[PDB]
Subunit: 68 residues, 12 copies
């Protein structure tokens, strides 16, 4: 009822696409941040090599509960 | 001719992903709002549950013709 | 004293210009929405054909008093 | 789980303050819009007269479930 | 008639809260600026001191009619 | 070369349209502000009465040279 | 089909007004950029000179098809 | 010394209102983050439960001095 | 060491989805623009027909190294 | 006392650079506006003259205490 | 008087600082783009390595006159 | 590989200027945050004291690689 959350930005990356970039970022975030509650996608970027998409980079706001 | 459009925000949700969240939102919107012309994705959120991405929420601007 | 307003987006269009696009949008909006109080221009676009301006499109926030 | 929400802007007003302006807006909105789920305060204004605050105006994003 | 308004930013402050910070700012503004018409809240800040909220600072757009 | 400018917001109004609202605002501003150099249109609003545009309100950033 | 567009910013200018500033900008843009599809007005500025509005400057996003 | 600050987002919650949501968030933040200096309110949200306000959520930028 | 980049907006389109809209836009952009380095998604739209998604349109900032 | 601040925009200019443009603007502002407390840089522009940087313009929010 | 300008984004880089990053970008831009008139700094970034600033990156809006 | 980054805000301060404020912030940040990759300048402020610029405050987004 009086829960407090903290939000930081995490950047997930994947050669495969936006969806996998998000999962990679959330998976890695979950290991150092406990109580991950939600994320909001705030930016989608790509690294190009020739005219080909080499890396997808997804910036997410990530909310997590502070312990009580 | 001189078509007039209205725009409101709709939030589509799905356990499955962004794509299905959008289709669910558009399908349900289409049943009360007629002449849907376009949508603009404005926000993508996810709820985590049991260490999984449980729910996707996509906020869309949805434009519809007033005229038929 | 404690009046409540609602705001939606309306897109007016006109071959003539910005001013007529707004009037067309307000006139058409006034026929389904009652008690129109104000509008705020949020976007002005033009559709070009053969490098000439065919259509003006003006997106407006439109506020209206809710009845009782 | 596959619920769809719609969001519009509602402006509550009160001579008394921000809090009462919000409650007035939500109360009146709840009478035409069913299944009100959340609101987000987006703007707080005042009408001034003789260097005194006569009216508070609070613009809120208001989300409501579409029936199923 | 064809009234003209000017708008500047005013920062009200109070140890007590947002509401009193606004009133303090408007009261002090009204003494040098005549014909105050409206304000729009643009920013709410707080200074923490000894692990307590010591000051609230509210930035407001303040509109006033120019004399004729 | 080392000229300093100040910028404030002025709201011009006219029953006739955007262009006349701007001229009315600039004319009235020029009487109390000296050395008016430029303006930038930042907002266009209207007061509606029935479904008819009664007043146009144009907010302008207005720059003026400080004397030396 | 799967048309690709490019968008750049163009600033049209005119002593006469906003409308002519836009036409001047679009006309000149159309001579190096082919397949102009749309423009979005993003900024309207005016230079004052000799107590008159001397120059209008309109910044437009201009979209053009790559394809013909 | 040339003091360095860090800023994160914290979400305070309260059934009671905005003011208490802020205090709850700041109090809880102060227990893991040392040397809290300031906060800026960036979002105020409310959960409705059968058309009554159940829960307030306030997102704040929170600045704190890094030790030396 | 002192590389210079340029950035323009590109709109990719696809009947298939966001991912393919981006690839189509990047592929076509790479044929007139050399040394594509990165892209940033700035807008995702869909054109609806009979309340079904016909076309995805993705606006991207696209950065490319200038030659010597 | 509960101090009240006013904020206006000032544009400082210098042939030399950003830093000197700011100091010129603040110095000149300090002569008509009393009790200058803070500034926030909001825009940095440069005029080119045959492909060399001739003039810097820095727009700043400037806060000053109102007397009591 | 009826001059038309075009604006694109250019990213200058330098190991030395913001000022040199801008000059590098403007110098290189001036070689392919003729009639450079102004720039507006829109973003300043750094590449960090071993907690040290290796590269400065400055994104600038750059305006240039189209030939007549 | 599929590197994950985190981003927080850091405020560097210096009596000397923007450049030194950034370096002070990055240096102090590097001592608690490992694997600093980039920063983005988001805000530049100055405190005025005795009619002089006493402190520069630069807010930066700071990205760092998460360990694996």
């Amino acid at each position: 009822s009086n829960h407090t959350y903290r939000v930081t930005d995490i950047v997930g990356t994947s050669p495969e696409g936006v969806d996998q970039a998000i999962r990679n970022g959330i998976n890695r975030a979950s290991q150092t941040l406990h109580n991950l509650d939600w994320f909001e996608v705030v930016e989608v970027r790509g690294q190009l090599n020739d005219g080909q998409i080499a890396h997808w980079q997804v910036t997410m706001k990530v909310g997590f509960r502070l312990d009580e």
